[PDB]
Amino acid sequence: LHKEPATLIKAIDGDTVKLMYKGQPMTFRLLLVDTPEFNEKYGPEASAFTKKMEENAKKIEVEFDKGQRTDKYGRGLAYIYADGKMVNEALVRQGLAKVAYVYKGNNTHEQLERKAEAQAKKEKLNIWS
Ligand SMILES: Cc1cn([C@H]2C[C@H](OP(=O)(O)O)[C@@H](COP(=O)(O)O)O2)c(=O)[nH]c1=O
Ligand SMILES: [Ca+2]
C-alpha cells in the first residue's frame, strides 16, 4: 500500500471525514473501524478526537487498501494519516472505536488494529470501561 496526499475540507465524526483527494471533495469512511454515532455513548468523544487529530495535522494522507475504494454510498474507503499517524489505529488504541467491518481483500492493517484494541481493552479505556 502507499500513502497519497489529501487536504482536510471538514471534520465530520469519529469515522468519517470530508477530504479533498485528487482535487475533488469526497467523504471518506475509515477502514476497519466503527465509532459510535454522535448521538451515542462516546460519539462526541470520538468525533472530538478525530477532529483534533485531522485539524491539527500539517499533512493528511490517504491510503487505499487492495480492494474496493468506495462503498455503496460513494464514500472513499481508506486508512487516513495525520502527520504520519494513522487515525484508524489511534481511534482503536484509545478505545474510541471498535475493530469492525473487516472484509476480505481490504484488511491489510487488521492485525495492527486488533493489537491496539487489545491494549485499549486491557487499559479499560472509554468504550471498554
Ligand atoms: C467501513 C465500511 C463500511 N461499509 C458499509 C457497510 C455498512 O452498510 P449499512 O449502511 O447497510 O449498515 C455501512 C456502515 O457504515 P457506518 O458505520 O458509517 O454507518 O457502510 C462498507 O461497505 N465497507 C466498509 O469498509
Ligand atoms: Ca459509525
From Swiss-Prot:
The active site is at residues 29, 37, 75. It is found in: Secreted. Its EC number is 3.1.31.1. GO terms for cellular component: extracellular region. It catalyses: Endonucleolytic cleavage to nucleoside 3'-phosphates and 3'-phosphooligonucleotide end-products. GO terms for molecular function: endonuclease activity, active with either ribo- or deoxyribonucleic acids and producing 3'-phosphomonoesters; metal ion binding; nucleic acid binding. Keywords: Calcium, Endonuclease, Hydrolase, Metal-binding, Nuclease, Secreted, Signal, Zymogen. Ca(2+) binds at residues 15, 34-35. It comes from the Bacteria. Its cofactor is Ca(2+). It is an enzyme of class 3 (hydrolase). Belongs to the thermonuclease family. Enzyme that catalyzes the hydrolysis of both DNA and RNA at the 5' position of the phosphodiester bond. This is Thermonuclease. The chain holds residues 86 to 220 of 228 of the full protein.
